Amino acid sequence: TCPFYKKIPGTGFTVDAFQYGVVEGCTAYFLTHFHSDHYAGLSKHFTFPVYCSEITGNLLKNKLHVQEQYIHPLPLDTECIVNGVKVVLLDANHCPGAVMILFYLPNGTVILHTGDFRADPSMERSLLADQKVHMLYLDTTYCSPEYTFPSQQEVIRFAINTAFEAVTLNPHALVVCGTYSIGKEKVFLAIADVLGSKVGMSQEKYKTLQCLNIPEINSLITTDMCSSLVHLLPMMQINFKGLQSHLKKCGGKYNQILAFRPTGWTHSNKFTRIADVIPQTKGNISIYGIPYSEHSSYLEMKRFVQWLKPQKIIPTVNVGTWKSRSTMEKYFREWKLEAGY
């Protein structure tokens, strides 16, 4: 049954609740972003109103074949009325088209649902600055102090520098980047830009990227693998057997692979700096795991929450175990005592 942390009290609304059938009392289903754990259940047979960003709506129409008449895209940073209730969508700094949702309840309560987000000080100058928020539905994916990772900019500099050095040493090296969902497009786009190449990929992945409103995209990506020296493959194929196999397919054009796996966190993070990251190598194949995250680190999360000063926090991630829940509630209390709210 639909969990309470997916329902918005005082409304007919749910958030990211498409796998429970017809939710009793729901007049409008919101979708924060196009990741499978959140859209699970949507298809061309869905006949209730879905509210989302323009980009999410492009993906629902083209990838899932949801019919147009049920897709209700909203502009960002704009006050809109849905079924009698004021709402605003804000950029969540997650994957393309990902939003946070502000609900202004008829009784005066203000609720922020973060969806999935990577908290940033730029959010402290959005429409959140303009009123008090009482209840926070929080993406707690990395809510423990061990979770440190570098800025996205530090990680992309590492990747660009590594790829440019390798391919300038060996012009017959191929760069491969793993993917299994939208998000993290900067990794492969920044590497292709430094090398003067388009990114090559499957027809299914090309179609997905063509839904994302990325500027100048026709100039950056392609389905002609033979003309490209950056290839995208499924994440599952980023291992020595998979990569050896792909190298065979390229008809002797290449004699080395340098591959990237953009993991979120890996416990190499508690000891090692980005400057110090090294690959796993076998023969003429090297694999780098790079800590590119689209979720808040512990410290980014804590700064956002201590700024916002909500009256009540409802976690949306790691809620299935008592140990996790109790850990998270302890940190919430520390933060509140340290800041004084």
Count of positions on this chain that bind Ni ion (CB under 5 A): 2
Nearer to Ni ion, 101 or 285 (CB): 101
Q: Is 214 left (phi over 0), alpha (psi -120 to 50) or beta?
A: beta
Tell me the closest approach of the beta carbon of residue 142 to Ni ion, in angstroms. 13
Q: Is 13 left (phi over 0), alpha (psi -120 to 50) or beta?
A: beta
Q: What is the DSSP code (8-state) at residue 6?
A: G
Name residue 337's amino acid: L
Tell me the closest approach of the beta carbon of residue 258 to Ni ion, in angstroms. 27
Tell me the closest approach of the beta carbon of residue 33 to Ni ion, in angstroms. 6
Nearer to Ni ion, 116 or 185 (CB): 116
Asked if residue 35 binds Ni ion (CB under 5 A), the reply is yes
Tell me the closest approach of the beta carbon of residue 15 to Ni ion, in angstroms. 13
Q: How far apart (Å, rounded) are the C-alpha atoms in residues 179 and 187? A: 10
Q: Footprint of Ni ion on residues 192-251 (CB under 5 A)? A: none
Asked if residue 6 binds Ni ion (CB under 5 A), the reply is no
Tell me the closest approach of the beta carbon of residue 330 to Ni ion, in angstroms. 25
Tell me the closest approach of the beta carbon of residue 309 to Ni ion, in angstroms. 26
Nearer to Ni ion, 94 or 205 (CB): 94
Nearer to Ni ion, 35 or 231 (CB): 35
Q: How far apart (Å, rounded) are the C-alpha atoms in residues 130 and 72? A: 26
Which part of the chain contacts Ni ion (CB under 5 A), choosing from 30-38, 122-130, 163-171, 223-231?
30-38
Q: How far apart (Å, rounded) are the C-alpha atoms in residues 79 and 42? A: 26
Given a contact cutoff of 8 angstroms between Cβ atoms, the answer to whether 182 and 208 are in contact is yes
Contacts of 324 (CB under 8 A, 6+ apart): 318
Nearer to Ni ion, 35 or 303 (CB): 35
Write each residue from 77 to 116 as x if it is in contact with Ni ion (CB under 5 A), else as -, in one continuous string: ---------------------------------------x
Nearer to Ni ion, 53 or 162 (CB): 53
Q: Where are the beta strands (DSSP E) in the chain?
A: 7-8, 13-15, 28-30, 50-52, 71-73, 80-82, 85-91, 99-104, 110-113, 135-138, 173-179, 199-200, 221-222, 230-234, 256-263, 280-282, 285-291, 312-315
Which part of the chain contacts Ni ion (CB under 5 A), choosing from 35-43, 160-168, 203-211, 296-304?
35-43
Tell me the closest approach of the beta carbon of residue 159 to Ni ion, in angstroms. 21
Tell me the closest approach of the beta carbon of residue 150 to Ni ion, in angstroms. 20
Nearer to Ni ion, 116 or 300 (CB): 116
Q: What is the DSSP code (8-state) at residue 239?
A: S
Nearer to Ni ion, 35 or 302 (CB): 35
Chain centroid, CA 25 distance in Å: 29
Helix, strand or coil for residue 83? Answer: coil
Which part of the chain contacts Ni ion (CB under 5 A), choosing from 28-36, 64-72, 198-206, 314-322?
28-36
Helix, strand or coil for residue 315? Answer: strand
Q: How far apart (Å, rounded) are the C-alpha atoms in residues 118 and 53? A: 17
Tell me the closest approach of the beta carbon of residue 35 to Ni ion, in angstroms. 4
Nearer to Ni ion, 35 or 184 (CB): 35
Binding site for Ni ion (CB under 5 A): 35, 116
